[PDB]
Design an enzyme around this catalytic site. Structure first.
Site, PDB file in Angstrom:
ATOM      1  N   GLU A 179       1.242  -0.208  -4.745  1.00 23.39           N
ATOM      2  CA  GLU A 179       0.351   0.781  -5.305  1.00 23.39           C
ATOM      3  C   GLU A 179       1.000   2.147  -5.439  1.00 23.39           C
ATOM      4  O   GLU A 179       1.331   2.797  -4.452  1.00 23.39           O
ATOM      5  CB  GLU A 179      -0.947   0.899  -4.498  1.00 23.39           C
ATOM      6  CG  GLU A 179      -1.868   1.991  -5.067  1.00 23.39           C
ATOM      7  CD  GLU A 179      -2.428   2.874  -3.993  1.00 23.39           C
ATOM      8  OE1 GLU A 179      -1.833   3.112  -2.961  1.00 23.39           O
ATOM      9  OE2 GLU A 179      -3.615   3.340  -4.287  1.00 23.39           O
ATOM     10  N   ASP A 191       0.795  -1.208   0.000  1.00 26.84           N
ATOM     11  CA  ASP A 191       0.000   0.000   0.000  1.00 26.84           C
ATOM     12  C   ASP A 191       0.837   1.272   0.000  1.00 26.84           C
ATOM     13  O   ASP A 191       1.882   1.348   0.643  1.00 26.84           O
ATOM     14  CB  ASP A 191      -0.963  -0.011   1.196  1.00 26.84           C
ATOM     15  CG  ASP A 191      -1.885   1.175   1.200  1.00 26.84           C
ATOM     16  OD1 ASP A 191      -2.662   1.416   0.297  1.00 26.84           O
ATOM     17  OD2 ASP A 191      -1.750   1.918   2.269  1.00 26.84           O
ATOM     18  N   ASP A 225     -10.735   2.621  -4.955  1.00 28.27           N
ATOM     19  CA  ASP A 225     -10.450   4.041  -4.891  1.00 28.27           C
ATOM     20  C   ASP A 225     -10.967   4.811  -6.096  1.00 28.27           C
ATOM     21  O   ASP A 225     -10.711   6.005  -6.241  1.00 28.27           O
ATOM     22  CB  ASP A 225      -8.951   4.324  -4.679  1.00 28.27           C
ATOM     23  CG  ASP A 225      -8.434   3.900  -3.335  1.00 28.27           C
ATOM     24  OD1 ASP A 225      -9.123   3.804  -2.333  1.00 28.27           O
ATOM     25  OD2 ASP A 225      -7.149   3.656  -3.365  1.00 28.27           O
TER      26      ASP A 225
END
Ligand SMILES: OC[C@H]1O[C@H](O[C@H]2[C@H](O)[C@@H](O)[C@@H](O[C@H]3[C@H](O)[C@@H](O)[C@@H](O[C@H]4[C@H](O)[C@@H](O)[C@@H](O[C@H]5[C@H](O)[C@@H](O)[C@H](O)O[C@@H]5CO)O[C@@H]4CO)O[C@@H]3CO)O[C@@H]2CO)[C@H](O)[C@@H](O)[C@@H]1O
Ligand SMILES: OC[C@H]1O[C@H](O[C@H]2[C@H](O)[C@@H](O)[C@@H](O[C@H]3[C@H](O)[C@@H](O)[C@@H](O)O[C@@H]3CO)O[C@@H]2CO)[C@H](O)[C@@H](O)[C@@H]1O
Ligand SMILES: OC[C@H]1O[C@H](O[C@H]2[C@H](O)[C@@H](O)[C@@H](O)O[C@@H]2CO)[C@H](O)[C@@H](O)[C@@H]1O
Ligand SMILES: [Ca+2]
Ligand SMILES: [Ca+2]
Length: 686
Positions: A257, A229, A328
């Site tokens: 990410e 993350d 998201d």
């Protein structure tokens, strides 16, 4: 085992990832459901717990939902213990249902389940040939206020129940106290808080060691991969050192990410994927796909440019994790849009290079705006949807047709709305035809392919208005009409004779570590593996077969090597570049140089006597260094991954383009710590 085996933790190119929001999937055990104002069984309030758990996941694996779809991997929410506090935002109650607000990385989130439930999850999954990937967010803890320590859990960090510290009164300096990021610069978004989340200080030995130990536990629990993350929010140097910790211990597929916006192309992004020891989530791919198939803000020429560009920018393009949407973004499917838009995007994703990831619910035509509207509870487990049948038909191709998993990509026909590409790997071919135009058919003529003479049926069986293909000599295809919204998949498979390397992992590690080489035509008898010019054979080759080889990294000097294999007969394969050999175990060190004045556009880099520093090669120097947040110009700083306990010689340099200016005087020296971190502060020598 074969390259396509579930036991293959090093390769996901042949898999299909199913991204599951644990809480929003299936509540298999109501006993572990959060109570009070933190729970909503009706899942009407999308900011509270709905009950989703690991048990539920197991049930869906055992009942055939995921298996029937063709899914061979699942990516679940962060499993670690989250804050228990209900954060009230202007009247809106919020919970850590998402798992991104860590409080203890050595414990599980009770809502999801116990350690035993987790172990059961791994077993059940593996039993159905399903790989398990976990989300890991070591950038921060939770939302905290240095001001109001009563707010949330003050971003408190625990070590297996033992309180380490909080955001308020941070005397140990576990966190960063630099304010909040505005995403203005990379450095800004790195050393400042991501929103209101207590930013962890990786330069702190305690945090460094703690995080590296936490992951090892999960590794021991049997995970097959990790999704990192907010990778753009942590020091690159520390992350590398982190990857080395994993790799030099228990290698597993890791992708992070790095959020990219529409039409956003970062060279920093490319470098990270190419040198960090981890791959990335393909944001360049996803955004482009949405422009072309969703919003129609770009055409097939843009999609094509993205394919050929990414292939040149990523050393290992086949490692990038592709998707069309996520937690998201707005769900791909718009409630009023034609479903054929989603179907086509799905088909395209599943047949393209990289590692396909499918956000749970997609197959069910779920629609929803930005967070948290995009995280609704899956409305059904029906297999009668078209999108479901599409994945179910194309997913498996990744395992049976190596052209789809490791093959190159080539445009064979293109226009505004039509795209025909060819995937090729060894004696394997796959041709995909897409017509985004939902109103006008397309007259296809002059199409040439690598397919052998004959007639080809549409793999989708006409599901998406696909058609048959007639191939004459020279692979020249007979003229045909491509229906509106038409999508067809044609293919040809055959045994590969020559050794062909399709994949390697890990891509970075120290000597003695066992790497995995996947491909075709390796033969059944042990051959030779080459790390540059160094030949490897015999015992060090722990395993050898047609599709997979397992070899230990030779004790060669640190550096970048090209991998190559040869069968028993001496026939060499293709080269597989960018393989990095580490000088040893790694530690994260912060380098600081004072009084390094530069001209606008001119930056400061770091070079040294180790491969981790570029071996004195300016073309391989570390940087550009930072000079805004932690330290200010003419003061520069940077966190680097260097071999532990090694005595390193180093120097700084000013670079403008390819023009280099060396630091005067003698080399600086220092001995890297054997563990934890350190900070080297020096003054620029004229
Ligand atoms: O857009 C972000 C930006 O970030 C990075 O920029 C790097 C530079 O590339 C590095 O050179 C370095 O910058 C240093 C300079 O080296 C140093 O001289 C000094 O710059 C002063 C200048 O002396 C001064 O002239 C002033 O210039 C004017 C310009 O003339 C004008 O065109 C512009 O509109 O405004 C500036 C500001 O008045 O600029 C500064 C004033 O202090 O200090 C900087 C350090 O801040 O380091 C930065 C990283 O911080 C990327 O490399 C770059 O590509 C990108 O553009
Ligand atoms: O040829 C082998 C050579 O390699 C290593 O030398 C490096 C120096 O240690 C290092 O300082 C750097 O030298 C630069 C100087 O710092 C700078 O002032 C100016 O003179 O340019 C030099 C680069 O050409 O890089 C060299 C490697 O090129 C090793 O340490 C030496 O013992 C050895 O002779
Ligand atoms: O014939 C080989 C030729 O095929 C493709 O060209 C297509 C083109 O994409 C269409 O827009 C249209 O003009 O028909 C052409 C077929 O003649 C490939 O794009 C091209 O590279 C290749 O030479
Ligand atoms: Ca539950
Ligand atoms: Ca950070």
């Amino acid at each position: 085992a074969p390259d396509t085996s579930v036991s293959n933790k090093q390769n996901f190119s042949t898999d299909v990832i199913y991204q599951i929001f644990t809480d929003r999937f299936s509540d298999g055990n109501p006993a572990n459901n959060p109570t009070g104002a933190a729970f909503d069984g009706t899942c009407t309030n999308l900011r509270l717990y709905c009950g989703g758990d690991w048990q539920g996941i197991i049930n869906k694996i055992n009942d055939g939902y995921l298996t029937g779809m063709g899914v061979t991997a699942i990516w679940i929410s962060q499993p670690v213990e989250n804050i228990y506090s209900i954060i009230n935002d202007s009247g809106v109650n919020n919970t850590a249902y998402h798992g991104y607000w860590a409080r203890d990385f050595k414990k599980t989130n009770p809502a999801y389940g116990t350690i035993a439930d987790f172990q059961n999850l791994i077993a059940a999954a593996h039993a159905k040939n399903i790989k398990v990937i976990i989300d890991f967010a070591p950038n921060h803890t939770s939302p905290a206020s240095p001001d109001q320590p009563s707010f949330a859990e003050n971003g408190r960090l625990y070590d297996n129940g033992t309180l380490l510290g909080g955001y308020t009164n941070d005397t140990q300096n576990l966190f960063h106290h630099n304010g909040g990021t505005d995403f203005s610069t990379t450095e800004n978004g790195i050393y400042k808080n991501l929103y209101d989340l207590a930013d962890l200080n990786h330069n702190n030995s305690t945090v460094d060691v703690y995080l590296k130990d936490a992951i090892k536990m999960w590794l021991d629990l049997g995970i097959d991969g990790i999704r990192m993350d907010a990778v753009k929010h942590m020091p690159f140097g520390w992350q590398k050192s982190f990857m080395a910790a994993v790799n030099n211990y228990k290698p597993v597929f890791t992708f992070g990410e790095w959020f990219l916006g529409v039409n956003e192309v970062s060279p920093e992004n490319h470098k990270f994927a190419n040198e960090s020891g981890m791959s990335l989530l393909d944001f360049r791919f996803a955004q482009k796909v949405r422009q072309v198939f969703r919003d129609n803000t770009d055409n097939m020429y843009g999609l094509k440019a993205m394919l050929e560009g990414s292939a040149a920018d990523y050393a290992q393009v086949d490692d990038q994790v592709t998707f069309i949407d996520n937690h998201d973004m707005e769900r791909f499917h718009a409630s009023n849009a034609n479903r054929r838009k989603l179907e086509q995007a799905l088909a395209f994703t599943l047949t393209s290079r990289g590692v396909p990831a499918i956000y749970y619910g997609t197959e069910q035509y779920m629609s929803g705006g930005t967070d948290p509207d995009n995280r609704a509870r899956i409305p059904s487990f029906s297999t009668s949807t078209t999108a479901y049948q599409v994945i179910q038909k194309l997913a498996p191709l990744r395992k049976c047709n190596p052209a789809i998993a490791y093959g190159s990509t080539q445009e064979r026909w293109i226009n505004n709305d039509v795209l025909i590409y060819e995937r090729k790997f060894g004696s394997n071919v796959a041709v995909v035809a897409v017509n985004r135009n939902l109103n006008a058919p397309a007259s296809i003529s002059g199409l040439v392919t690598s397919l052998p003479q004959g007639s080809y049926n549409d793999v989708l069986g006409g599901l998406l208005n696909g058609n048959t293909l007639s191939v004459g000599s020279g692979g020249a295809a007979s003229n045909f009409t491509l229906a509106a919204g038409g999508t067809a998949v044609w293919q040809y498979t055959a045994a590969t004779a020559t050794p062909t390397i399709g994949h390697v992992g890990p891509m970075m590690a120290k000597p003695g570590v066992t790497i995995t080489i996947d491909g075709r035509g390796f033969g059944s008898s042990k051959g030779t593996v080459y790390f540059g010019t160094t030949a490897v054979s015999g015992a060090d080759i722990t395993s050898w077969e047609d599709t997979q080889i397992k070899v230990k990294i030779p004790a060669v000097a640190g550096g970048n090597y090209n991998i190559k294999v040869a069968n028993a007969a001496g026939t060499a394969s293709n080269v597989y570049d960018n393989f990095e050999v580490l000088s040893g175990d790694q530690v994260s060190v912060r380098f600081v140089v004072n009084n390094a004045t530069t001209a606008l556009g001119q930056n400061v880099y770091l070079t040294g006597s180790v491969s981790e520093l570029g071996n004195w090669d300016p073309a391989k120097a570390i940087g550009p260094m930072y000079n805004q947040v932690v330290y200010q110009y003419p003061n520069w700083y940077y966190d680097v991954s260097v071999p532990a306990g090694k005595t390193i010689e180093f120097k700084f340099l000013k670079k403008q383009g390819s023009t280099v200016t060396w630091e005067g005087g003698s080399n600086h020296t220092f001995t890297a710590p054997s563990s934890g971190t350190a900070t080297i502060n020096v003054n620029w020598q004229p």
